[PDB]
Amino acid sequence: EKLGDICFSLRYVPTAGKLTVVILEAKNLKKMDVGGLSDPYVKIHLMQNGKRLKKKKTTIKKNTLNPYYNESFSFEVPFEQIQKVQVVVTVLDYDKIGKNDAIGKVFVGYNSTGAELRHWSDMLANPRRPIAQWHTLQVEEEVDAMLAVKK
Template sequence: MNKERCASRDQWQQCSYSPIGGAAGLGRGWSQPLQQQQQQQQQQQQNGSGWQAMLQCTRAIGLKERWESVDLGEIMFSLCYLPTAGRLTLTVIKCRNLKAMDITGYSDPYVKVSLLCDGRRLKKKKTTIKRNTLNPNYNEAIIFDIPPENMDQVSLLISVMDYDRVGHNEIIGVCRVANNAEGLGRDHWNEMLAYPRKPIAHWHPLVEVKKSFKEWHGRAASFDSQGSCPSPKPPSTP
């Protein structure tokens, strides 16, 4: 920079470098005098609160849209366990406000229930398919034989699926119940064990498939599979 163009110290203070035009001279590359800069800064500070409010509003709208985009619907089912018979009954009652998966604005939902143990799928069962609806009613019972000594080792993965005639069926959302599940999934399981022989029904929100759920789906195993988790055995007959 050429300081000779500012004859005095006062003039030097008025000559502040601006990165817009580089160091080409006072006509280009140098900002306006300090008084005009101060006036602009004061005006920006006065308008700053308005801009901040607009930014906060925009962020709030974006956050709302993000939460709304992951609203997959809910499923209601009941759990009932008979310790003497070693029988767990999950009754799929209904779903509501499911995510539309087809171009028609509807889905063809059915429910798949997988019996898991340490990430291995031991068995799976399905409900019937309900056509063109986002609020299907099922009232279908799914039964698994699980001895009491294995109840702490197993979990149930409930997947609401969209049937597709062409291609693969899509997962709308899932939920999980077990003694080591999170939130409502754990509470529902513990309530079932606390009140044996009594059906306990709750609504469960559907969530997106996590990595752990994908691993469970990929590790299918039969009752004869060998692993760290013993396969549930049928209860002994008296």
């Protein structure tokens, strides 16, 4: 519970023909530090045909429970290819300004779950409305088999 949860806005840019995932805020960095707080930090990777193509990262303020910053992840590709991609959100933590892992992770795109795919090929399939949606993120144990050619 509360191990993975991010509210990202799925939208497309029909003016230039490119993706633009606007991550508003997240709610998964629960207080794991004894009498303290966690240090949220995430990055995004897209697996084109099961192969890591483009790699990007975001900036989040440490010592918080809700990773908020509002950043946009752009990826230029045809509107017909946006429905056959696979983007995976990689969440991490900097335990006491050091190093930590085993946080939430999720894959969104072509062969994703209904909750994600039904909004993916819905809002960023053609419109440009920044509709943020939340979803439970699973540990990196599941992502290990997803980044290894899942399509």
